[PDB]
Amino acid sequence: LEKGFTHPTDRVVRLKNMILHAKPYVESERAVLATEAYKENEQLPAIMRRAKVVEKIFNELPVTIRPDELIVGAVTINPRSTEICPEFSYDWVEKEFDTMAHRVADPFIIEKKTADELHQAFKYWPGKTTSSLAASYMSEGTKESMSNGVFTVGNYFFGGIGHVSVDYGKVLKIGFRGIIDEVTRALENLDRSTSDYIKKEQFYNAVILSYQAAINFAHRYAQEASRLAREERDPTRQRELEQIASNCTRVPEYGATTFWEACQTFWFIQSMLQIESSGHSISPGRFDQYMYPYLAADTAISSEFAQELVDCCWIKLNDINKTRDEISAQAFAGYAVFQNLCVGGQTEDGRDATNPLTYMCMEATAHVRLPQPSFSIRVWQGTPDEFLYRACELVRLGLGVPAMYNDEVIIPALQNRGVSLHDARDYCIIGCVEPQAPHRTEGWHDAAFFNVAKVLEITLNNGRSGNKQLGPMTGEMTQYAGMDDFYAAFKKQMAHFVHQLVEACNSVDIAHGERCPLPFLSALVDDCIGRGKSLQEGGAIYNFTGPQAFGIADTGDSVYAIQKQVFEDRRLTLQELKGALDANFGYRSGNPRYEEIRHILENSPCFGNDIDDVDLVARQCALIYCQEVEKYTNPRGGRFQAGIYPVSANVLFGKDVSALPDGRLAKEPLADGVSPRQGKDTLGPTAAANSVAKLDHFIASNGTLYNQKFLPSSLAGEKGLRNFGGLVRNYFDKKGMHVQFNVIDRNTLLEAQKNPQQHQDLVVRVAGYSAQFVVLAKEVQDDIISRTEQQF
Amino acid sequence: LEKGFTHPTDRVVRLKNMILHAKPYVESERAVLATEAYKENEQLPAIMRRAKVVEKIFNELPVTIRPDELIVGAVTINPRSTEICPEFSYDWVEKEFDTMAHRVADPFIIEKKTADELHQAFKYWPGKTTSSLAASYMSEGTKESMSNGVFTVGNYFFGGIGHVSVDYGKVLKIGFRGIIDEVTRALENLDRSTSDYIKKEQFYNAVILSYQAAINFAHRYAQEASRLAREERDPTRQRELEQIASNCTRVPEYGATTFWEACQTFWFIQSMLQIESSGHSISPGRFDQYMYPYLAADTAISSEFAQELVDCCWIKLNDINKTRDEISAQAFAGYAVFQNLCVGGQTEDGRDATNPLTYMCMEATAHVRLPQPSFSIRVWQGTPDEFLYRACELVRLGLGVPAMYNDEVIIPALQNRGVSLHDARDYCIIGCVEPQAPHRTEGWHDAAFFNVAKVLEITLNNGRSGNKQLGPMTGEMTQYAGMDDFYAAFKKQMAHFVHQLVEACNSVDIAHGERCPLPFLSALVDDCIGRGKSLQEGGAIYNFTGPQAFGIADTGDSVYAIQKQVFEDRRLTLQELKGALDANFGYRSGNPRYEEIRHILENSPCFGNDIDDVDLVARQCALIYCQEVEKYTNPRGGRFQAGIYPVSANVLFGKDVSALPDGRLAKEPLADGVSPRQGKDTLGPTAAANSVAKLDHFIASNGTLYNQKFLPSSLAGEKGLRNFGGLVRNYFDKKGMHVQFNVIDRNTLLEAQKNPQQHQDLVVRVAGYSAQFVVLAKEVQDDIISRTEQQF
Questions:
Q1: Which chain A residue is nearest to residue B42, measuring alpha carbons?
Q2: How many CB atoms lie under 10 A from the CB of residue A116?
Q3: Which of A337, A458, B11, B545 has the maximum number of C-beta atoms within 10 A of its C-beta?
Q4: Distance CA A205, CA A202 (A)
Q5: Catalytic site residue B432?
Q6: How many Cβ atoms from other residues are within 10 Å of residue B82's Cβ?
Q7: A199 vs B503: CB contact, 8 Å cut-off?
Q8: How would you classify the pairing of strands A738-743 and A707-710?
Q9: Euclidean distance between CA atoms B371 and B765, whole angstroms
């Protein structure tokens, strides 16, 4: 059960190190072309304008094929660089012209020719962003709440949406000409009796015009592959390019007939989508399922060469990059675009879905060892031991991937939200940990972060934050009688802020629906073509909005600490807990009663130790959150659904919370997702796993996230892997939704800190994705080093 | 019965002449302020952007009290001038910069400071107009039909909607501050458990800001009234001014307290609506019904000063003007904004509504004798003889006023469209001849002009116009087996073109609903405040779209000519008639066979002579249109309903049509509304009355327009009045909807052509409104001259 990994070809390693060495830039071509496309087409409906944006970008964005590539397609000229998408938001880019190359998290080079031309185009945009329109639909108190860091909807307000697994399989089989046929045939069968055929007809005419330029983009890479073949001196590389040219002339305009073609089809879809919009989490989904039929009917390709194309695709998935404002960028830190590819799991009928491309994807990860993709596996009851005990063997490489997702919790959870058993069985994972029925969902799976710790802070402070009346006056802390009177005030505060959070999410939603529906993306999700409506107008079968709680373990161990240390053991007064909270447990003041109260509170039973009383409080606070969220609906007919996952913002939004009744000093990091709090699960990985499984994962149907970290030597040998497999299975059997493990010594991370030059390829999990450790700001690195170390 | 007419005050005669001796200017200030408000507010929802538009104009537009006015409120610096609303269209204004002052129909002085001022603002606009959006929603086939003269939606394409009678009485009781309070009580009762509140709340927040602004606008006219009063050195005019100043400080901010303030509340509404949007046919409606409480409740006011105030309302209604592109101006000729004001009829409770203010509204029209208001009376079985005779005795002054509307056809016509009996009973007339339940409707009572004559042309040419295949090839003329085959072809044509006519009107509808929902107007129509929506989004209780037919008589007498002279009486063959039609009856060749054929067709029986044979063809052809318009719905959720009236384009649209089977030569005029062809009704008015009544007026529920012209001596004496009253009852009793009259000698109109400088105040009826005869183009003049002269 201990099988080892093969090596990649010298080209793959060359292709890899190109990603690894490359310095990221901001680039202006797409922002200039896009801008000029809005200028020329003020008079069209938003859909037809957006078709003109992609037609001009596809027709004119520089074509770039890199030395040694087999799969081709590049969003920027320079590897790992970013375009600028000012249709969503701009001003923060021009503010950081001079600072973005020197900033802490995710720095980018902005050289002056680029700032000059990005400066020009930005003169068009003031108040024409989707963000500025989303800003205007918001109530005043909702901005105020977001300003005091209760919650934020920055992801889709600053940037695009994305967060979708499109119908890769459809384009592989009928092509772009196939999509166009389905739209011309829909266009003939329009009911033209009422008024509402007119906007539909506009959608269709947009979708067709986008795919006619989405064809010309492929062709337009094809002529540059021939151009490079006629001018190439190595005869063998000449023939690679002549046939790369042949691959791009057929796909994706038509269906794939080789594997090579099928791999190139995948990449144009994956790449072109992130040109139309800067939405990240364009997640390839079940790429072992919809890419395998093309491998099996390739009776010409060899084993080695198939694996090399899977390695190339992996490396191209790392070519995408995306800049955010100095502060947003610390929450998605690592040049991360969160493109999630799951292998394994069930077919829609019930059989296991393992196939030979499942293991080659597992090999490709072990070949490339880069942060993308967000490689994942699906676990269900019939999962072959050979599969789990091979994903495990891969995990022990200490890249963080695969993350593991549980069919037996996610599938019933998707059903609770109106997903059919047939569609739930086909689920993929989006971005970090969020499940959807692929190519039939507008997910909005990271619309917002929401800081439940901050709601506890405010709850205790009578609706106040700072000295600013931010929430309802639900009683002063010193006037609670029991925990009943707490959960009363806490539920009221939760209904206030969740209602505000929803207003913010729906405002960004109306915004995107009204100023920037996508005619390209929309044709690759059911049911936009049949319904003649964009994803942004509710075109998908299933519609959701996913806001993220965190500070969950924090809120819990805190609410329990008040229960135990004030009401049950009577070891302090409510007034003393107030005075201690206010004084930051006397951190500056050196007040020793407030340190003695801290010490008491630090040593309360903690969520994460298989202790029912404290685990049930973590569960109840998690529920209070998740239950408010699901009451509310979005403008596309869909229902909000809670998730608990921290991207890299648990250090960031930790700064928004004062000292909590669990002994946490003001402004320190918060708990990552549903992980037990940093270093406070002390009895080992099963005790930890058991506690996390007591949370209602089913109701948090936008996905939960659990982080464990192992030292390597505790996963060495075959009874290393046998225990690592029995813990996954124990956790999933006890109804937990997800777990992903770091496997790394702490001196490794410490030497990564002191000597960054010699750890450029050290890749580890942050949360729901992996990153290069040295790209992470030190406060984040320390949070990762502070996470508990599990031992068998 | 002959009672006579009082004379107006010398003041009213100075105010009358001020209108008459005005030179219309194009002005810029409201066009520039509108433009700056757009620039400043790119980021806002459209409804909110339109609050800031109306706000800037209201807070900043020049305030102008004209000498002598008792009722003040001016749209333009210069009397009887036009503003510019570039949001709907702009480009024709700039193309006409130097031509507009010199064109034939409706010139305007543009001074160059005005042109430079407009030139600059227009730089903002390319592509951002409602015209531009409306246009790109229409299909190439629909633009082609329009380009070839089959039909036009230009009215709401180039300009605003209007065509409304708002809730004056509600602003009269509770004022703008009362409107603000309904929006606050709506805002506080909002169901905030969905996403639908976010847009209803913008609209409410948009209605308050507009109505605050409107209150400043009235307050500003008061500061001007007081500024002038401090400098007045005639004491009579001084108290007048400080008494106007008091009126504008109460009304319409609050409810009217005297009759004077009720009048200044009216005029502020009637003026300011036309400031936010250039949509015309802003129709006062039941003015005698909703002002009269405030006249009765004034125990202080004299009848002489009450009648004088009502006269300043008539004059102040002539102060409004609107320029259109130079072709448009030909179809809405005469500086005409069609603000229709009716008196009399039934209450909601079924009994007669005459009150002392009814006869004061007739006396106004005898005093002022200017084109506006488009003065109307309602008639039902229970009309007191007093009122019909006094209304005639006024029609006999030969201004064209009042037009006459039949309750017994209009009320059930609206019931067939879903209007309650309670609501239809209270109906007023919009524009020319279009009825609505006032303040409960967005009726679009002039969405389009649809050329029925042009469709006959296109049918007999197998769907061609020029050598260009415009409709289905329904079969060639030479192959008709009888009149059955023709109607088959005619109805397939009408179904094709009416479908595009709908696609046209609905694009203009979507355009307006997306780029110019009006928060000010919207608040004075049920049920916009209740529902949280604008008139452009279906806020109204009732919703319609009214296209108009041209050449009904023309289609009728042509179809019948075929039936009789070809199939019945074999005087022509199908081929000869194709040759003669195609050769314009040899108007140019000199072909005598075609000259013979012309004489044979043109001497067929004609609609308007009480001849059932031919009158029922007219009924059939009008139905074919009316019955097809009926099938379609609009984006606000209401039915299309066909009207029949010509405004001023029965000449202009005749130009689009070849020779027809009735012997009309190519490009000659078409027949006005449902009236007989010009001079073809030769057996007298009672015989023509009977013919127009055989038509189905009920299905044509956007209104039909019948014209008659009379020898002044034939209506002389009270024998003339008993005759004239007995003709109106004849035609109403026989289920005809509307009749209006000219009372004018032929040589009066001839001398007016030949010494226009001594007939400046000759007002006559054109069609559903009256205009200075001399202002009209010679071809429109000649058309009115060429109308049949009735004689008892």
A1: A127
A2: 11
A3: B545
A4: 5
A5: yes
A6: 24
A7: no
A8: parallel
A9: 9
